[PDB]
Structure 1
């Protein structure tokens, strides 16, 4: 990580809360940045977790992972400073832009998220909280995997049941993210409670296709939701498939049937 001097950082507005501090938008000497602070009184564990987060983030160098600008560790409050993405988090972005993108644009966002996840998994970094709310979107529509902290309905069964978090449980979550993107940010499983979601999964039910969804994309998300972890695609498989679909874009014109929940009869 690069150490940044505090005189170069201007905090401007609060945009969220940290484990023992706040998150701000600000400017870095000017480029806009996001700034997470660790405020006076933090515990030893909080310091270890905070500087540990900075240290792992400093290792990430990929187009589809949030970029660390630097850290303030030599002065108080300590800070983690990242690039700032003006379109914000992906879940809110898509809900505010319903129906505004082409299928190819949506699938391109998924390819980018998958490439970032392949990078993390390859680095032996298990995300554990992959969801559209933890993905940032830049002004080129590039998605940057991030983690803002605390998700039953995004989590694989083995991770819920016995705390087995691996890249393969992240693949399950990625399938949910695919469904979030293709629905413009719908809530997975709609109004079902967390217990009803787990019961449905265990009974064998899976999310139905989004509207206007390429058949290949629904097939892929379905294979991310295999109960048996060993049967799920690896991230390398996901990236490869998405890349090939984008590069032969007529492949995306074949749509999965959408199951009507409502019948409208007209003459």
Structure 2
């Protein structure tokens, strides 16, 4: 893993919490903005194993749609994981703050990138387990980078909830939820339904309705991510292929799925 000397790192502002430390925005020299997760004094053996194991896995990833590791500080305390910094932040907050500001093609392009990152992870035998818009970072080119900030019933496939079966096919279910989050500009999946109500609805066959202004092809694809039978879901290769063909022939996205009105306004 690229070892960074502590003299090259300056922590500026706290931006989150780690499992045994804080997460900071800072600068890296040898300047470049970075995010920094620390492992403070007193960490346990298991925490050190997990922290350095995470750095080791991240160092193996080299893909346009996966967060990039700048390096690690393991020879000095506190230990640190240092990544590139993504100015637009997490995707869920980004879309909620930019409601209605993007074209359908831009939104579908974000999904194509997330799917490409997930295809890479699945091919590398890495099961994400927490794919959601809150774990996807956005850069100033609108490129989405799959990440994992730590701790999701509403995003999780039935088999993963029921018997802890987490696979790339349960990640596909989660990706379908992410597609819905993107197309709705960050709407909470299932709205005010409780966790138990969500699972009951899913087991009874109900699924999230189409977002407003949503291409028919995109809704059909998210629906197939939500098949109860894990083996019937698309693989990420299938998802990337479909999204790539839709974007290439963008008139395909002009056909919209019918939106079910919740409110009726009658005027002359």
Indicate the TM-score class for this superposition, using the shorter chain for normalisation: over 0.9
The whole-number CA distance in structure 2 between the counterparts of 1:225 and 1:178 is: 11
C-alpha deviations, 1:100-143, integer Å up to 9, x for none? Answer: 00000000000000000000000000000000000000000000
Question: What's the counterpart of residue 64 of structure 1?
Answer: 65
Displacement of 1:243 after TM fit? 0.1
Give 3-state SS (helix, strand or coil) of 1:22's partner: strand
Displacement of 1:265 after TM fit? 0.3
The whole-number CA distance in structure 1 between the counterparts of 2:60 and 2:139 is: 21
The whole-number CA distance in structure 1 between the counterparts of 2:49 and 2:263 is: 53
The whole-number CA distance in structure 1 between the counterparts of 2:7 and 2:265 is: 63
Displacement of 1:185 after TM fit? 0.2
Displacement of 1:173 after TM fit? 0.0
Displacement of 1:235 after TM fit? 0.1
Q: TM-score, normalised by structure 2?
A: 1.00
The whole-number CA distance in structure 2 between the counterparts of 1:70 and 1:257 is: 48
C-alpha deviations, 1:225-254, integer Å up to 9, x for none? Answer: 000000000000000000000000000000
The whole-number CA distance in structure 1 between the counterparts of 2:156 and 2:117 is: 18
Displacement of 1:89 after TM fit? 0.1
Displacement of 1:212 after TM fit? 0.1
C-alpha deviations, 1:183-208, integer Å up to 9, x for none? Answer: 00000000000000000000000000
Displacement of 1:71 after TM fit? 0.1
C-alpha deviations, 1:43-78, integer Å up to 9, x for none? Answer: 000000000000000000000000000000000000
Give 3-state SS (helix, strand or coil) of 1:4's partner: coil
> Which segments of 5 or more consecutive residues in structure 1 lack a partner in the other structure?
none
The whole-number CA distance in structure 2 between the counterparts of 1:116 and 1:145 is: 6
Question: What's the counterpart of residue 12 of structure 2?
Answer: 12
Displacement of 1:42 after TM fit? 0.1
Give 3-state SS (helix, strand or coil) of 1:69's partner: strand
The whole-number CA distance in structure 1 between the counterparts of 2:49 and 2:265 is: 58
The whole-number CA distance in structure 1 between the counterparts of 2:224 and 2:152 is: 20
The whole-number CA distance in structure 2 between the counterparts of 1:145 and 1:264 is: 41
Displacement of 1:213 after TM fit? 0.1
The whole-number CA distance in structure 2 between the counterparts of 1:105 and 1:143 is: 11
Displacement of 1:223 after TM fit? 0.1
The whole-number CA distance in structure 2 between the counterparts of 1:262 and 1:127 is: 38
Cα root mean square deviation, aligned: 0.2
Give 3-state SS (helix, strand or coil) of 1:79's partner: strand
The whole-number CA distance in structure 2 between the counterparts of 1:48 and 1:152 is: 27
Give 3-state SS (helix, strand or coil) of 2:2's partner: coil
Equivalent residues, number: 267
The whole-number CA distance in structure 1 between the counterparts of 2:194 and 2:186 is: 18
Q: TM-score, normalised by structure 1?
A: 1.00
Give 3-state SS (helix, strand or coil) of 1:136's partner: strand
Displacement of 1:259 after TM fit? 0.1
The whole-number CA distance in structure 2 between the counterparts of 1:263 and 1:60 is: 50
Give 3-state SS (helix, strand or coil) of 1:11's partner: strand
**Aligned runs of 1:1-267 on 2, under 5 Å?**
1-29=1-29, 30-267=31-268
The whole-number CA distance in structure 2 between the counterparts of 1:100 and 1:261 is: 23
